[PDB]
Structure 1
Amino acid sequence: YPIINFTTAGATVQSYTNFIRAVRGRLTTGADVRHEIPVLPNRVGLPINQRFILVELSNHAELSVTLALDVTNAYVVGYRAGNSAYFFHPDNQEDAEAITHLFTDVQNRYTFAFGGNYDRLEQLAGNLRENIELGNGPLEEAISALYYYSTGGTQLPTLARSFIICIQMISEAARFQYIEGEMRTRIRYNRRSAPDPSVITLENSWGRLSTAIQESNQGAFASPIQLQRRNGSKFSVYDVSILIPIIALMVYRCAPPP
């Protein structure tokens, strides 16, 4: 499976940008595009040899971890740290069988009983996304946390918090240039900060947005979608046009019309 590398050690806006750009290139072929927005591969009939991509994260502490992302939704399905790999609770028999194709040579394999969805992770973390700082420092720390979990150096709440950081800085950034932009800002000024409502709402609305766009009539939504500004004020999206600079990838929702 394709591997993309990134390190928090000496990270810059440019190195982070190249990284996210590479992730997007491995996530989608670039064949399916709608109203200028790339669509991730349809999971139906997708060969298992093209189902995942690996993201190896390293940090200043010289510690590395490898996350496994599902190309059909950009989810982080699990990770390997040394001789141990951990997977989030599979959701269907298909996903359960699919992850056995990852890190096939790790000595110890484990499957968590919980999922990687935010509601769950925030619950185990004891903190909501809005109270979890993001940036290069948090990422660097998240990597170490993930690394020492198997040896008992990381408590579950910290592990969950770490997943929340990685998922947003990798998967969400890949999905939205607007969140990749938020992370670029954090790196550029070396400031760690929790995601504002604009980031939070985009993250929660990815599925709805992907579907609205794909089912739109020549780009116009049948029903508007409500997002939030940085100050938390509400604003409506009635067309795909306004999302072009915001969403970089969509989950496959339907076949494109003639």
Structure 2
Amino acid sequence: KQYPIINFTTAGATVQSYTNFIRAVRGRLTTGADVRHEIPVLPNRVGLPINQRFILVELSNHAELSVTLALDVTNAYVVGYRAGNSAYFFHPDNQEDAEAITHLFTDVQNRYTFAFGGNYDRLEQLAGNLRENIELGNGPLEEAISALYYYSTGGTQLPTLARSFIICIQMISEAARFQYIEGEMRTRIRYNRRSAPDPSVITLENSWGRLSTAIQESNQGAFASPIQLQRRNGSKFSVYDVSILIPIIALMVYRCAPPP
């Protein structure tokens, strides 16, 4: 089965090539049909044809190594990847997702399913480091592509693999979900400055599902409960309404149908 493929290379990467990549990814994740308070909602998992379930991100680096990440269109999240003759999948949450991933990389010679899921809690434990201690940028991405590629012949240990997934997920999935995080990566690429995400980034990533719920359930734009987020300096602030999120969040996971 063929899914839509978006290419990115770290080789001669610019602010514009990274931006064109992330815009292409958002374009393929959304039908455009569902928009709540100006923010697009990803397709509902329920009833979604398998032929429309995934998109593929092909990543190449200066070493001319390529890996293809599979993203689930329902949550923009990485479900697995291919490196040459091997494909690797996170442990699916449920039997429906276990069945869904049998449709990815169907021609690959070797298929592997990890015992662990792709959630940050587990990936941080395998990496031996939190996201706040893992640098992001074109350099970390170049390194993550090599690490993912060389897992296929065991040239990569599990902690380095896990760190590589944390880099890829943030620079692709989280950048697609948030204009703010795309902006943080664009600043790194423009000025050639690798750095770990600050608390403003980590708390947005943490809150994505909760912000998606809060916006979609909202009393015509206003939240039932205040979501707590962090400033760059790590101080906590409360978000009561959708207006402050429209500049920040690009995509939401489907929670419920639009209100009456």
Q: State the TM-score, normalized to the length of structure 1.
A: 0.99
**Match in the other structure for 1:135:** 137
Q: 2:68 aligns to what SS in structure 1?
A: strand
Report the CA distance between 1:237 and its aligned residue. 0.4
Separation in structure 2 between the aligned mates of residue 226 and residue 197 of structure 1, nearest angstrom? 12
Report the CA distance between 1:152 and its aligned residue. 1.3
Write the deviation string for residues 226-257 of structure 1: whole angstroms up to 9, x where unpaired. 10000001111010000000000000000001
Report the CA distance between 1:56 and its aligned residue. 0.3
Write the deviation string for residues 57-82 of structure 1: whole angstroms up to 9, x where unpaired. 00011000000000000110000000
Write the deviation string for residues 36-56 of structure 1: whole angstroms up to 9, x where unpaired. 000000001000000000000
Write the deviation string for residues 56-110 of structure 1: whole angstroms up to 9, x where unpaired. 0000110000000000001100000000000000110000000000000000000
**Match in the other structure for 1:182:** 184
Q: 1:241 aligns to what SS in structure 2?
A: coil
Q: 1:14 aligns to what SS in structure 2?
A: helix
Q: 2:88 aligns to what SS in structure 1?
A: strand
**Match in the other structure for 1:233:** 235
Report the CA distance between 1:2 and its aligned residue. 0.4
1:178-217 alignment runs, 5 A limit:
178-217=180-219
Separation in structure 2 between the aligned mates of residue 42 and residue 127 of structure 1, nearest angstrom? 33
Write the deviation string for residues 92-145 of structure 1: whole angstroms up to 9, x where unpaired. 000000000000000000000001000000000001100000000000000000
Report the CA distance between 1:157 and its aligned residue. 0.3
C-alpha RMSD over aligned residues = 0.5
Separation in structure 2 between the aligned mates of residue 152 and residue 112 of structure 1, nearest angstrom? 14
Report the CA distance between 1:150 and its aligned residue. 1.3
Q: State the TM-score, normalized to the length of structure 2.
A: 0.99
Separation in structure 2 between the aligned mates of residue 62 and residue 23 of structure 1, nearest angstrom? 22
Separation in structure 1 between the aligned mates of residue 84 and residue 259 of structure 2, nearest angstrom? 47
Moved over 6 A (4+): none
Tell me the percent identity: 100
**Match in the other structure for 2:118:** 116
Separation in structure 2 between the aligned mates of residue 41 and residue 234 of structure 1, nearest angstrom? 32
**Match in the other structure for 1:32:** 34
Separation in structure 1 between the aligned mates of residue 66 and residue 194 of structure 2, nearest angstrom? 21
Separation in structure 2 between the aligned mates of residue 95 and residue 152 of structure 1, nearest angstrom? 27
Q: 1:188 aligns to what SS in structure 2?
A: helix
Separation in structure 1 between the aligned mates of residue 45 and residue 83 of structure 2, nearest angstrom? 27
Separation in structure 2 between the aligned mates of residue 142 and residue 61 of structure 1, nearest angstrom? 12
Q: 1:86 aligns to what SS in structure 2?
A: strand
Separation in structure 2 between the aligned mates of residue 101 and residue 68 of structure 1, nearest angstrom? 11
Separation in structure 1 between the aligned mates of residue 122 and residue 170 of structure 2, nearest angstrom? 15
Separation in structure 2 between the aligned mates of residue 94 and residue 117 of structure 1, nearest angstrom? 18
Report the CA distance between 1:222 and its aligned residue. 1.1
Write the deviation string for residues 137-196 of structure 1: whole angstroms up to 9, x where unpaired. 000000000000011110000000000000000000000000000000000011100000
